Amino acid sequence: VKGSVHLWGKDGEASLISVDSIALVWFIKLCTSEEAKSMVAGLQIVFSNNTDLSSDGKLPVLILDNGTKVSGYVNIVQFLHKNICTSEEDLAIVGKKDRLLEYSLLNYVDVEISRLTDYQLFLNTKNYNEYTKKLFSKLLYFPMWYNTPLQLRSQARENCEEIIGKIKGKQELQQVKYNLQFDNRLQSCVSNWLAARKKLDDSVILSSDLLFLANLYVQLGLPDGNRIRSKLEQTFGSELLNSMSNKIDDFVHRPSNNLEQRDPQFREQGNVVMSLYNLACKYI
Amino acid sequence: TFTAKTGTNFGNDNDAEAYLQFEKLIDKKYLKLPTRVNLEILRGTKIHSSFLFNSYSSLSPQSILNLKVFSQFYNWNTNKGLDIGQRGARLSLRYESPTLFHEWFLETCWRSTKICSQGTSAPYMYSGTMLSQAGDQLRTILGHTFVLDKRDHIMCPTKGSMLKWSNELSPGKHLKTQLELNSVKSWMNDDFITFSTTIKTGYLKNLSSQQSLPVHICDKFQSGGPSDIRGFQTFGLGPRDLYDAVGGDAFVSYGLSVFSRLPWKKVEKSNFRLHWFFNGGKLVNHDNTSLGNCIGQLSKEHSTSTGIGLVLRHPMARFELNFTLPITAHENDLIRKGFQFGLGLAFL
Amino acid sequence: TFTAKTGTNFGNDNDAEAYLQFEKLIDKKYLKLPTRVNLEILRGTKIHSSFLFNSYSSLSPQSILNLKVFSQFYNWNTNKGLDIGQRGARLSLRYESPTLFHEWFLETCWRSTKICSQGTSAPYMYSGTMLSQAGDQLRTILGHTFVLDKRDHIMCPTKGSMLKWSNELSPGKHLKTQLELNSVKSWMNDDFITFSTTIKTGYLKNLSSQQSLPVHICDKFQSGGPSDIRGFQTFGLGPRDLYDAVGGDAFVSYGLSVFSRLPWKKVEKSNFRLHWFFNGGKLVNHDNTSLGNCIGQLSKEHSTSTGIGLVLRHPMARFELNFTLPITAHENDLIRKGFQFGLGLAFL
Amino acid sequence: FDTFPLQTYAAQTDKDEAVALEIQRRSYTFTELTVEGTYKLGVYNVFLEANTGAALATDPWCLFVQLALCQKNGLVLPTHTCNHEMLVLSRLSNPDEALPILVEGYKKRIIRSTVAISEIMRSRILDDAEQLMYYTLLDTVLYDCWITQIIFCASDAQFMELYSCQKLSGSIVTPLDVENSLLQKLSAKSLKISLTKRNKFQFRHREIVKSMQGVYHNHHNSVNQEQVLNVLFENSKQVLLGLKDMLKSDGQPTYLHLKIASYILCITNVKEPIKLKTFVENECKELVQFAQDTLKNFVQ
């Protein structure tokens, strides 16, 4: 289908503040079969970095050149699996007998597991200042460097408020407590997802695989990623964490020849002019 | 000679500060110097109870002793926050057209600290820092405060400057130093356009034997609010532990303001001014080794805001109705953009 | 002509509302009658937010219209209780040395009712009655209030009587009637011993078509407290559902008090009086058939109390420090014996 | 001295008869012991099931807990001695402002809120990971469509019929009915705003909840709002067309079968032509028949 996909990264690499934009670069990378390419041939991906082109204010957006904006990774993929004309080595299309379990597993990562990665990129104080606040200076434009992540930790503290919420000896008593609230939450959500992923097929990568793997790529790839990899190996062993990291290493070391991109034009990019205009149309 | 009086003194974050004061000008056959006792009962939305005995006594033509015995309960750091028990004494000596006075005091205070945040609200006031601030402590503190108010009005200023320099030494625990400048300039024949700069800086050193004995959260510097850098909530700037403003050990907080007299023909004799401001500042937890690395982090990552508004300047209060947008902010700051009511006496 | 003012109106249970009011006396080329608008922002421990526009307008030498547009949020029935949203309008006409005035009003009000009791506290505000009071309702109410204050002081009375007779009709829903008498007598040449009787009775009929459309908990009569029958907590008398005072549809609340001028030589010019009182009353949920069975249960099973105390009578407040013991009580009443601080303006 | 109440009386056991008449016209007693062991389920409103003749709650969460309470205790649904009654409440009977609550007990009275009930209902299917996947999908995708179809696409009279405990007569004849129809115009938005805070709807759909708070309905928001609603609806059809291939119970209905049935029974109660009602009645006739076969387990 003909349209332009807007994402979060810069210069061909998707940003790590979004597990959905990493999964959507990997989606179009692995769409190499004849049925899998026909739903994606016509998608010029844009690293536009402004959420004023979104309908949700959330920037994995698929704009479709007729006014149709589909926002989010799970909404885009189910929109792309729907517009197949319908006339294993890569991403395979799920058959109709399993279209509900694949949408249930896609929705589970988006509401349970991607909630936990927004805790790590934003609510972890070691992971935030050492990595994450150094990113929005490069993605956004100059005056709007600070107000855009300001909401993204409000949005991350509201989303994770129900699970993980002589001074230096009590600050370790609270962080050991919150490293146990997380590692009992992440132990359950990954166990619930992996016990349901076994029903579909244990041989073929799917669309819900690329969102769970892009959540494992960000969480293990942050400054606090070495004890999360240590705790996932404690319950899931070492064979599965290396097998799910060999698949991660495949999708980042993948050529971008299928990916035809473009520069964001001067109705995109979130300029000083092209965000004061989107502020005026939003009110007038 | 008795003069029972009362008040309410509206503030900022919607309180009350309701006070009721008694007095007795004493005859000259208990003492010989003019003595003036007091007794203040205060209630407010923040105050649970507040009894405040005073004893002013003019020693000289320019000298006033002030034995202030207090016992006050009040709430703090408003989401639900902390309620502070605070009882003790305070013996202050104040020494003496430019207003000039020094004022040395000496205050003993037993201070309690409940975390009354009612843990159903889950992550607030329950960080590792606030959980260790809970408890009782007793503290003597020596102090000094020098004011060189050269302005022609502390109500509606048009000329002059100000310099407020207040040191506080708790011996063996900490040394708090705080500076505050002001500068008012006017440019027209009606005192029409009133330029006004305010800069406040402060430093808090831990004098406590290999960095034991931490400074309490009520003595650390706080930043943000309508009576501070506008555009943020109160206790909205500085470093955090979880979501709690744990205060800073050093700060700077500048400010700029223009007042433009509301150019309508009928109403140009009033106290209503058109207010454009620009506020901003920084609040750091420094390391106590160098004053060079204290200034180094105090100028790199600021949280600023400008905003247009309207200001009324009453005798006891300055009513401010600002529309404020934060230009530059830190990540973990508490933004309050849009309309914001300002009310009080000390703005910067 | 503008007069931004402050103060405290001293609320129902020792409590206090801190308020901030603006004003504008309007010239005679929008109107021709003397008009006086207002805008009250109120602050308190119970109030969440309270905006109150007023418009007084003298129609005659003895007539005052009062368009009162309000929008107030406040908490109610204090353990944790209910917070009441309340917005609407009120057009009151007040008609006119014995103080005499009638005052007819007409008030539309959309009223919300949260149960904010936070169910970890298990059985409170979660009876079957309070769970059905939650929700929104819109109500017009017609009213009338007649006052025949014949006392020489509404501050420190010594002679005279009072008669407050206030009817309220919500058409098709209910009719609330309330009477209040007072009688002050003094016996000595210094106005030393001040006898004071207060009796308050009320009736609430359900005019709503085979006993549908129940009267809301905020309109029913409540009994008990320091500004009521002393010796019990506020909302401490009357019938209950589980532990919640569900109010009554009829009541009587008498009172007796003696003031004895504190017989010391120096201080016998002050407002400190020695206070012995005797309070008591009854609060019933009657059946709407007969006024004879309404009076029959209103005189059989009373909850009374006496108590000795000390009273100060300020201009805006009457400070009472009573030691109170309940003589007769119901079973499910909320006893507050021992010391009790009283503060407000309306005691009975 | 703790002897000073000289006469300690009885408990003043006279009650208001008009209040207990609305606790009776809002209660729908579950037909099959004590007073401390019986609970009262709070619901938004009620409707008469046209086929069976049972009082069902008008919300898919209030109806799902109602059917899960019938299966757990062996109850019969109430038709429209200290039994387990239902109770038409207001949202404002909570600090949470979300009605599927449980008022358990009389003297030692526990309140389990909607967040507390949802943790109880979700924990009974945590043993099977695959059934938790579908249960999360109806709680997120099918839920957010139903909330948007009923707050934006349905009118004010259709939302307040299903989500308000206020009364209705249908015809403005009396001055009470003019006043009751001004409550449904004034208080319509505050009940809509309160419903968007129930299943973290305010956190998944932050920008259309933000446009509900605002006056005059800014024109750029309404074009973007139609995009999210169409994506939510096209997702919802793929949920509903996929549910039809697994509606086979080998015993008692599972907690997912009562979950599907509580959505079809509340969507087909909507008298207005919302797109979910037009879809499930014409394209999902196998789902409508399933939502009556599972309802007939809990009636007589």
Q: Rounded distance, CA B329 to CA B281, Å?
A: 10
Structure tokens at A78: 């189910």
Inspect the structure and tell me whether chains A and C have 3 or more CB pairs less than 8 Å apart: no
Tell me the three state secondary structure of residue D293: helix
Give the minimum alpha-carbon distance from C261 to chain B in angstroms, rounded to a whole number: 19
CB under 8 Å to C178, separation ≥6 — which residues? C164, C165, C166, C167, C168, C200, C201, C202, C203, C221
**Exposure pattern of A75-101 as b/e (b: 16+ CB <10 Å)?**
bbbbbbbeeeeeeeeebbbbeeebbbb
Q: Which chain B residue's Cα is nearest to C15?
A: B43
Mutate to test the interface with A, among D135, D222, D223, D227 (most CBs of A within 10 A): D227
- Residues 8-37 of chain B with CB under 8 A from chain C are 8-10, 14-18
Q: Rounded distance, CA D151 to CA C210, Å?
A: 36
Amino acid at C207: L
Q: Rounded distance, CA C167 to CA C205, Å?
A: 11
Q: Rounded distance, CA C124 to CA A143, Å?
A: 52
User: C58 at the B interface (CB within 8 A)?
Assistant: no
Structure tokens at D209: 């909840």
- Flag if B314 and C16 touch (Cβ within 8 Å): no
**Could you tell me if D86 and D30 are in contact, meaning their C-beta atoms sit under 8 angstroms apart?**
yes
Other CB atoms within 10 A of residue C207 CB: 14
**Domain ranges (residues) in chain D:** 21-121
Q: Please state, in angstroms and as integers, the Cα–Cα distance from residue D194 to each residue in C182, D200, D209, following that order.
A: 47, 11, 10
Structure tokens at A73: 């990774």
**Exposure pattern of D12-25 as b/e (b: 16+ CB <10 Å)?**
beeebebbbebbee
Touching subunits of D (3+ CB pairs, under 8 Å) are: A, C
**Exposure pattern of C277-314 as b/e (b: 16+ CB <10 Å)?**
bbbbbbbbbbebeeeeebbebbeeebbbbbbebebbbe
User: D185 at the C interface (CB within 8 A)?
Assistant: no
Per CB-CB distance under 8 Å, the chain C contacts of D103 are 126, 131
Elucidated via: cryo-EM
Give the minimum alpha-carbon distance from B237 to chain C in angstroms, rounded to a whole number: 25
- SS3 labels along C275-290: EEEEEEEEEECCCCCC
Q: Which chain C residue's Cα is nearest to B6?
A: C7
Question: Does CATH number 2.60.120.380 belong to domain B5-344?
Answer: no
- Supply the DSSP symbol for D149: I
CB under 8 Å to C76, separation ≥6 — which residues? C46, C82, C83, C84, C218
Alpha carbon D177 to its chain centroid, in Å, reads 25
- Flag if D207 and A155 touch (Cβ within 8 Å): no
Going by C-alpha positions, the residue among C252, C273, C147 that lies closest to residue C203 is C252
CB under 8 Å to A212, separation ≥6 — which residues? A109, A113, A193
Structure tokens at B301: 């990552």
Residue labelled with tokens 């020695």: C274
Resolution (A): 2.9
**Could you tell me if A74 and D238 are in contact, meaning their C-beta atoms sit under 8 angstroms apart?**
no
Residue labelled with tokens 């201080």: C267
Q: Euclidean distance between the first and final Cα of chain B, in Å?
A: 38
Tell me the three state secondary structure of residue C11: coil
Going by C-alpha positions, the residue among A10, A160, A36, A154 that lies closest to residue A89 is A36
- What sign for the dihedral angle of Cα C143, C148, C152, C157? negative
- Flag if C301 and D175 touch (Cβ within 8 Å): no
CB under 8 Å to B101, separation ≥6 — which residues? B94, B95, B146, B147
Q: Which chain C residue's Cα is nearest to B119?
A: C120
Query: What is the maximum alpha-carbon separation in chain A?
Result: 70
Tell me the three state secondary structure of residue D13: coil
Query: What is the maximum alpha-carbon separation in chain B?
Result: 65
Per CB-CB distance under 8 Å, the chain B contacts of C120 are 120
Going by C-alpha positions, the residue among C161, C171, C164 that lies closest to residue C144 is C164
Closest CB to B18 among C8, C118, C120: C8
- Flag if B127 and A166 touch (Cβ within 8 Å): no
Q: Rounded distance, CA C62 to CA C56, Å?
A: 13
Structure tokens at D22: 């609305």
Q: Which helix (H) or strand (E) holds A45?
A: strand A43-46
Structure tokens at D51: 């086929």
Q: Which chain B residue's Cα is nearest to C314?
A: B4
Per CB-CB distance under 8 Å, the chain B contacts of A148 are none
CB under 8 Å to A146, separation ≥6 — which residues? A136, B328, B329, B330, B331
Burial class (CB in 10 A: 0-12, 13-18, 19+), B266: exposed
CB under 8 Å to D109, separation ≥6 — which residues? C122, C123, C126, C242, D103
Where residue B14 falls (left for φ over 0; alpha for ψ -120 to 50; beta otherwise) is left
Closest CB to C7 among B8, B270, B316: B8
Closest CB to B10 among C6, C16, C118: C6
Give the minimum alpha-carbon distance from B232 to chain A in angstroms, rounded to a whole number: 12
- DSSP states along C187-246: -STTS-SEEEEEEEEEEEE--STTT-SPPPTTTSB---STTSSTTB-TT-SS-BSSSSB-
Structure tokens at A163: 């699970």
Which spans in chain C are helix H?
Answer: 128-133, 292-297
